[PDB]
């Protein structure tokens, strides 16, 4: 099933347990923890639906809420799982080599461990130095350098 979205049968608030609240450029949050668990309480304590949630979602509704059910209350990826940003601002590219670093598809690889992963920290405003950034096989950033970024937002990462 290629459909990420996750239906509620009934109207129970989801209660949201071991997540990780980051500010993500909306509203809403990204969870940055593997083993998260959903429950429903509606009446009573007792819960009728757990799922399972990756990292990187961003959940449609808040904590909570008493979701009407038959909606989406989490969202994410269901091929990729994205690595999220600390510092918001430019991102700090180093070692950025042309023609055996990059692949033109703007959206370009970051490096190739094989072919050769130069770890930075995302600039403040423009160069500014405030975390490390692991580019794994096939890693590609499409945000170039001086994007400006906020914090809660990410590229394609193109899982290898």
């Not at 347990?17 to 993500?24: D, I, T």
């Amino acid at each position: 099933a290629a459909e990420s979205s996750i239906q509620v049968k009934n109207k129970g608030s989801i209660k949201l347990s071991n997540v990780k609240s980051v500010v993500n450029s909306s509203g809403k949050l990204v969870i940055t923890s593997r083993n998260t668990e959903l429950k429903l309480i509606d009446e009573f304590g007792r819960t009728k639906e757990s799922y399972k949630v990756p990292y990187g979602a961003v959940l449609a509704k808040g904590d909570g809420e008493q979701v009407a059910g038959g909606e989406t209350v989490a969202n994410w990826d269901p091929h990729t799982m994205p690595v999220i940003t600390e510092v918001s601002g430019f991102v700090r590219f180093t070692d950025m080599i042309d023609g055996q670093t990059i692949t033109r598809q703007s959206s370009l690889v970051v490096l190739d461990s094989a072919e050769r992963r130069p770890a930075l920290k995302i600039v403040d405003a423009q160069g500014n130095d405030v975390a490390q950034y692991f580019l794994p096989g096939k890693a590609i950033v499409q945000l170039e350098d001086g994007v400006q970024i906020s914090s809660g937002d990410t590229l394609a990462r193109i899982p290898q």
